[PDB]
Design a protein around this ligand. Structure first.
Ligand SMILES: CCCCCC[C@@H](O)C/C=C\CCCCCCCC(=O)O
Length: 146
């Protein structure tokens, strides 16, 4: 069945902001190499401090974001930058989840704890992403010598 955590809750999907999640799949041809998200503090009200990292060529890169959580919704802000996402799927143990990136032509992403194990859950996330983004070429951001 591949039934995951329901109802879907962004905070729960992020392991209550106690873990780092890496981007493993994306329909975005602009997806950044090694894009990783990690907690950078405790949960301020419905907001969560997050440090996003990635690699540009051989150089590591960094940015700080404020996540605003509302159920399954995630509003990420940095300066004048605002990114809206909706966690559409969340694995049983909150090991991996699938996001819809809100925009003119929406993109879909698969994030997961940076660890092995719970491979059936990983497969389920992959399956849910295929459903949401069927027919879309996928990129593998974490498979870039990260
Ligand atoms: C809080 C731990 C991180 C969980 C991962 C959240 C995942 O579902 C995606 C949610 C928000 C991602 C924000 C995207 C920010 C872009 C980072 C790269 C860049 O644009 O510079």
């Amino acid at each position: 069945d591949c039934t995951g955590s329901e109802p879907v809750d962004a905070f729960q999907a992020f392991s209550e902001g106690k873990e780092a999640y890496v981007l493993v799949r994306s329909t975005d041809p602009k997806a950044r190499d090694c894009l990783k998200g990690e907690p950078a503090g405790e949960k301020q009200d419905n907001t969560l401090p997050v440090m996003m990292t990635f690699k540009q060529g051989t150089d590591w890169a960094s940015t700080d974001w404020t996540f605003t959580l509302d159920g399954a919704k995630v509003t990420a802000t940095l300066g004048q930058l605002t990114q809206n996402r909706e966690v559409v799927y969340d694995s049983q143990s909150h090991h991996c989840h699938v996001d819809k990136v809100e925009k003119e032509v929406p993109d879909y992403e698969m994030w997961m704890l940076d660890a092995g194990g719970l491979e059936v859950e990983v497969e389920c996330c992959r399956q849910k992403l295929e459903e949401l983004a069927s027919g879309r070429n996928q990129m593998y951001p974490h498979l870039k010598d990260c």
